Amino acid sequence: MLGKDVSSELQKVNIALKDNTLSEPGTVKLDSSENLVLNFAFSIASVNEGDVFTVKLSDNLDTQGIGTILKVQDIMDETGQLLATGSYSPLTHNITYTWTRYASTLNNIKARVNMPVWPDQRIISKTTSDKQCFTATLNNQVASIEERVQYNSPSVTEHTNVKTNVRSRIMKLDDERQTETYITQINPEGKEMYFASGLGNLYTIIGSDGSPVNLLNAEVKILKTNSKNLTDSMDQNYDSPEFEDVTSQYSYTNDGSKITIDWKTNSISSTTSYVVLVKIPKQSGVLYSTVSDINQTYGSKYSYGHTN
Ligand SMILES: [Ca+2]
Ligand SMILES: [Ca+2]
Ligand SMILES: [Ca+2]
Ligand SMILES: [Ca+2]
């Protein structure tokens, strides 16, 4: 930036991070659709078209949650006209606002914004026992708040004849493509999984309760890794050396309502975990995943929902 960033000329600047909407202030429950709230305000005597100002967030804070939209809401004046448009950058964790031609015609502009912000699931990708520090800066004013970040734990069954564990999550909603990504972790706990003789192979069934979800066009990818490489948000680099693509090894059936994967064994070792990624058009409905027999009579089941 050589010039034109007007953040240093803003007056009466205020900025704050708040957690009033959390069910239990002190902890953000990312699997209970919780988030923090950012607000800021200022005045500015005049601006030029194309000038910018920047709201800086800490590296562990984003404007997205599970979304993919970079735009943030426009800033409007009292007449309902547009003062500035803005966008979030994954690179810098900054929100950059650009003043409009309309704004450049005014004098004594007031700006005020409220928006949700989330602990970034790619950065704080696992449940934390201790509080994390979240900050935002606008010129010389800074806000901070501390919160633990919590994700749900896996479903586990540990009996003599059946040992299973599983977890799933809708971890991405793509705005442009109108899709959702539903990820299933098989053996996220890194334990022995087992069905005793007479109980058949271990299977993973992916379906919906309500089956309102259409899976006919699902894109399915299956990866193998050690559990120590798995995050709780499931938003991680799946192209890394720690993951092997085994999609071709484990064929599946799909009747449009259920996807059934035969693991081809009654035993999965503690050091073997699988991740099944299912991408489908965005749809309302609660999806579930299992590690079970084909009839979902025994084993484990985890559910995760979404509403348009
Ligand atoms: Ca929510
Ligand atoms: Ca930064
Ligand atoms: Ca820490
Ligand atoms: Ca773990």
Numbering used by the authors: 317 to 526, 530 to 627
The authors write:
Like other MSCRAMMs, Srr1-BR and Srr2-BR contain two domains, termed N2 and N3, with each adopting the DE variation of the Ig fold.
However, Srr1-BR and Srr2-BR are more similar to each other than they are to these structurally characterized MSCRAMMs, with a root mean square deviation of 1.6 Å between Srr1-BR and Srr2-BR and root mean square deviations between 2.1 and 2.5 Å when either Srr1 or Srr2 is placed in a pairwise structural alignment with ClfA, ClfB, SdrG, or UafA. Notably, a bulky amino acid of the N3 domain (Tyr-623 of Srr1 and His-528 of Srr2) significantly constricts the center of each trench. In addition, we have recently shown that Srr1 binds to human fibrinogen via its interaction with the Aα chain of the protein. Deletion of the latch region of Srr1 is associated with reduced GBS binding in vitro to fibrinogen and hBMEC and resulted in attenuated virulence in a mouse model of bacteremia and meningitis. To address this possibility, we constructed variants of the Srr1 and Srr2 BRs, in which residues in both the latch and latching cleft regions were replaced with a cysteine, such that a disulfide bond would be formed, thus fixing the spatial position of the latch. Under reducing conditions (1 mm DTT), the mutant proteins had mobilities identical to their WT counterparts As compared with the WT Srr1-BR and the Srr2 BR, both cross-linked proteins showed enhanced binding to fibrinogen.
